[PDB]
Amino acid sequence: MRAVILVGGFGTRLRPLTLTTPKPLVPFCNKPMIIHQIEALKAVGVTEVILAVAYRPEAMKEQMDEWSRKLGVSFVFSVEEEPLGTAGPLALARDILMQDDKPFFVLNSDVTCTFPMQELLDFHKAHGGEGTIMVSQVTQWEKYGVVVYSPQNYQIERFVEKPSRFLGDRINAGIYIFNKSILDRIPPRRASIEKEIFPAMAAEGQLYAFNLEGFWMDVGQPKDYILGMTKFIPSLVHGNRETEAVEHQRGGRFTVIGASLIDPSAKIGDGAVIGPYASIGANCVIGESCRIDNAAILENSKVGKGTMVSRSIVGWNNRIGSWCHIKDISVLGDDVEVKDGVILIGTKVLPNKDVGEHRFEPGIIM
Amino acid sequence: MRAVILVGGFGTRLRPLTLTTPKPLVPFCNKPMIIHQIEALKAVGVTEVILAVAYRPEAMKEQMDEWSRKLGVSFVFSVEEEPLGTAGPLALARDILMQDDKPFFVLNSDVTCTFPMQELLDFHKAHGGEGTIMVSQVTQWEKYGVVVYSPQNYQIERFVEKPSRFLGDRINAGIYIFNKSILDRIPPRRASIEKEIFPAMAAEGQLYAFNLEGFWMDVGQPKDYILGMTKFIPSLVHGNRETEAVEHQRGGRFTVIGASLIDPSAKIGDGAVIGPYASIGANCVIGESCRIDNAAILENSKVGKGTMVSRSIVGWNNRIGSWCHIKDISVLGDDVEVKDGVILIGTKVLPNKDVGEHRFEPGIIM
Numbered sequence: 001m002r003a004v005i006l007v008g009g010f011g012t013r014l015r016p017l018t019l020t021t022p023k024p025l026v027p028f029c030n031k032p033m034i035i036h037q038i039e040a041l042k043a044v045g046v047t048e049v050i051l052a053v054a055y056r057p058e059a060m061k062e063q064m065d066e067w068s069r070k071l072g073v074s075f076v077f078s079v080e081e082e083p084l085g086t087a088g089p090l091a092l093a094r095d096i097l098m099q100d101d102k103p104f105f106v107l108n109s110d111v112t113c114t115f116p117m118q119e120l121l122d123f124h125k126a127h128g129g130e131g132t133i134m135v136s137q138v139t140q141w142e143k144y145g146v147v148v149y150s151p152q153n154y155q156i157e158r159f160v161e162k163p164s165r166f167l168g169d170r171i172n173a174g175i176y177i178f179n180k181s182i183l184d185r186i187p188p189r190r191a192s193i194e195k196e197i198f199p200a201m202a203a204e205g206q207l208y209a210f211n212l213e214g215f216w217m218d219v220g221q222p223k224d225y226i227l228g229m230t231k232f233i234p235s236l237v238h239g240n241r242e243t244e245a246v247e248h249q250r251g252g253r254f255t256v257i258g259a260s261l262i263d264p265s266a267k268i269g270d271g272a273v274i275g276p277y278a279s280i281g282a283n284c285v286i287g288e289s290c291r292i293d294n295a296a297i298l299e300n301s302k303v304g305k306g307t308m309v310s311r312s313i314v315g316w317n318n319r320i321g322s323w324c325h326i327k328d329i330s331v332l333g334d335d336v337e338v339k340d341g342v343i344l345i346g347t348k349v350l351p352n353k354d355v356g357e358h359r360f361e362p363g364i365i366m
Numbered sequence: 367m368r369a370v371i372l373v374g375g376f377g378t379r380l381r382p383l384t385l386t387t388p389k390p391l392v393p394f395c396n397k398p399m400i401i402h403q404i405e406a407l408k409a410v411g412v413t414e415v416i417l418a419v420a421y422r423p424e425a426m427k428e429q430m431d432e433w434s435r436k437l438g439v440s441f442v443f444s445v446e447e448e449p450l451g452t453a454g455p456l457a458l459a460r461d462i463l464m465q466d467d468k469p470f471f472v473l474n475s476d477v478t479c480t481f482p483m484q485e486l487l488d489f490h491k492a493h494g495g496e497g498t499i500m501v502s503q504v505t506q507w508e509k510y511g512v513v514v515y516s517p518q519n520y521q522i523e524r525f526v527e528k529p530s531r532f533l534g535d536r537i538n539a540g541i542y543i544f545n546k547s548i549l550d551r552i553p554p555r556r557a558s559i560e561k562e563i564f565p566a567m568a569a570e571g572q573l574y575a576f577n578l579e580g581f582w583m584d585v586g587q588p589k590d591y592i593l594g595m596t597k598f599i600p601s602l603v604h605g606n607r608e609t610e611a612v613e614h615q616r617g618g619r620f621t622v623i624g625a626s627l628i629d630p631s632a633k634i635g636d637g638a639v640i641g642p643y644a645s646i647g648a649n650c651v652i653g654e655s656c657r658i659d660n661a662a663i664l665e666n667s668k669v670g671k672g673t674m675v676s677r678s679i680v681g682w683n684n685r686i687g688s689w690c691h692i693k694d695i696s697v698l699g700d701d702v703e704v705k706d707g708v709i710l711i712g713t714k715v716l717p718n719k720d721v722g723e724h725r726f727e728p729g730i731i732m
């Protein structure tokens with residue numbers, strides 16, 4: 001069995017972080033998103049993964065995916081292309097897929113969940129896609145805007161965008177499984193699986209929905225990134241080596257208020273308070289009395305004593321001041337440096353900036 | 367020789383702090399303002415001080431002035447009255463002053479300076495007031511609005527409020543010395559020495575100005591309070607017992623960036639940074655990594671770890687949160703409690719309040 005992960009795309013919603021690295025390689029918790037998906041696929045038994053590489057063809061994706069040496073898995077890297085939409089990469093990779101009898105997986109690099117992959121053995125009952133349109137129950141389906149009408153027969157009647165009537169609560173989950181015959185349907189041009197191939201499959205009656213019992217989150221947005229991290233860390237606390245604690249004696253003496261993920265190589269202050277559902281990257285340095293409430297600290301980032309970053313994302317090589325407050329949903333770029341006492345209330349800072357002014361309202365720092 | 371200190375007044379400009387204690391008893395640095403003035407007068411040799419008490423007749427001024435037991439000085443406390451303006455208390459205290467031959471001092475409880483009181487022996491050269499209208503050079507005389515025209519003869523021509531032309535830079539310093547004959551000029555009614563008696567003396571030619579070489583500040587306003595504290599602390603560091611530090615090993619280990627005043631009974635953190643020109647009151651508790659930049663911490667106030675209060679005044683029995691900012695010119699009342707993470711940018715909080723909302727603009731919390 002083999003999988004195809006759509007690793008292209010410009011990462012527009014995660015823009016301050018995706019101006020440096022592609023969206024699949026943006027670290028979620030303490031690993032890249034695509035790495036979580038590849039680990040799930042390896043747990044399945046999948047050995048071949050095909051990456052649809054359009055954004056950063058060789059500068060980032062090929063070089064940074066040295067994880068092929070680990071994980072006992074190999075990536076094809078034969079879908080280098082110009083932007084071909086969401087469905088075109090499958091048409092391009094038709095040749096490398098060989099049109100074998102065995103079906104193949106399809107995944108997006110923006111989804112996190114328990115990854116129930118027993119949809120391989122299940123849902124083989126005469127489906128063009130064996131429960132391919134995987135769906136999750138979300139009470140906020142109106143703003144998500146992709147509602148899938150799945151009856152008890154699981155035959156997709158239609159796809160509705162922003163439905164006024166309560167047709168259903170299930171929304172697309174971004175995980176698919178296709179028989180290779182679909183390669184005939186996909187044209188060799190720019191197309192979207194969501195808005196071109198899927199309506200045709202639903203009309204033809206070959207599209208079947210698979211329900212998702214566990215948690216699910218599309219983390220392609222900073223708000224969704226934070227909330228999905230909150231949902232995800234409790235699942236992964238016992239999985240990894242990172243009382244009411246996960247890493248309580250890494251550096252000096254500091255307090256942990258709940259689940260978190262602190263890398264072994266990170267030094268965590270003295271008396272700091274690593275809050276619930278917080279991620280600290282490798283080689284990161286945390287000040288004495290910091291408050292890492294719901295923030296993600298990525299790679300070689302340094303945070304000064306007394307800083308309080310909550311529900312915010314800081315970049316890879318930041319140098320945060322001492323007594324700062326980075327609140328709300330604030331995203332910092334690759335090399336942003338913040339002076340002491342600066343308050344950023346949900347402001348997105350582009351890479352390689354220096355912040356020295358208080359920003360009390362959401363905005364963008366060019 | 368005796369002095370009279372105008373200790374009445376409602377303290378309107380220092381309102382958040384003067385709703386609990388009178389303006390003379392508001393602690394400046396680590397002592398009441400009137401205590402600084404009385405110490406200066408005792409250094410001169412004045413043994414009798416007459417306090418014109420109108421605001422809080424006996425609830426505050428009489429009880430709290432147990433300093434008469436110390437300092438080797440005695441207060442008459444015979445000018446309890448209804449509001450009689452700035453000049454009326456002298457008419458009321460005419461009798462207790464006994465109309466003796468020896469001149470008498472007059473002071474306001476709002477002025478801080480080096481207190482050059484050699485104007486006693488000096489300026490006796492045929493003056494109704496021996497350099498009574500003491501003046502200080504201020505480059506911002508427009509906003510101060512009380513400009514004294516002092517020529518080389520020192521005869522006050524007139525008083526001008528907000529003068530358009532550059533008549534002069536000297537302004538009233540709030541310290542006067544009077545021959546007792548002035549008791550005949552002051553009528554027994556509500557009057558103002560600044561706007562009724564002093565223009566009359568200037569017209570009569572019996573009003574003489576005394577120049578002030580040293581620093582001076584009227585600290586009746588919170589901004590003026592902070593700036594006068596900044597000017598004053600360096601003079602007082604060597605005077606009192608409170609490298610580049612004044613009190614550097616009081617509690618645990620902490621850093622001092624300049625002049626400060628930390629009471630012996632205050633416990634100061636374990637990594638805190640007591641900044642330049644900061645005052646910490648008695649029995650105060652400071653958190654592990656606080657930052658007291660230019661703030662005055664009064665009495666039994668507790669500050670949590672990571673809090674940064676700069677250029678702000680906290681009340682007597684406050685309980686500040688852990689990771690708060692109290693920035694700009696912010697004044698807190700007697701018993702204000704601030705929750706963790708709250709940011710107060712120059713907001714005045716009335717006594718006995720609880721603050722749990724961020725305030726990014728100057729304002730008043732009722």
Ligand SMILES: Nc1nc2c(ncn2[C@@H]2O[C@H](COP(=O)(O)OP(=O)(O)OP(=O)(O)O)[C@@H](O)[C@H]2O)c(=O)[nH]1
Pocket residue numbers: 005006007008009010011012013023052053054083084085086089107108109110220
């Ligand atoms: N190979 C490839 N994959 C894409 C492309 N556009 C989107 N995807 C995939 O679709 C999923 C989500 O879309 P993103 O591009 O990341 O999000 P976006 O940048 O806001 O843009 P859209 O969702 O496409 O409107 C991710 O798996 C992407 O990798 C593309 O042009 N080429």
Ligand SMILES: Nc1nc2c(ncn2[C@@H]2O[C@H](COP(=O)(O)OP(=O)(O)OP(=O)(O)O)[C@@H](O)[C@H]2O)c(=O)[nH]1
Pocket residue numbers: 372373374375376377378379389418419420449450451452455473474475476586
């Ligand atoms: N005894 C007495 N002293 C006063 C009175 N009003 C002002 N003073 C003195 O004048 C000086 C400054 O005035 P304050 O009253 O403190 O300041 P304020 O509250 O803004 O009001 P102003 O009188 O307009 O200045 C202080 O020494 C006061 O003690 C009063 O009604 N009675």
Ligand SMILES: [Mg+2]
Pocket residue numbers: 108110111218219220
């Ligand atoms: Mg997405």
Ligand SMILES: [Mg+2]
Pocket residue numbers: 474476477584585586
């Ligand atoms: Mg004053």
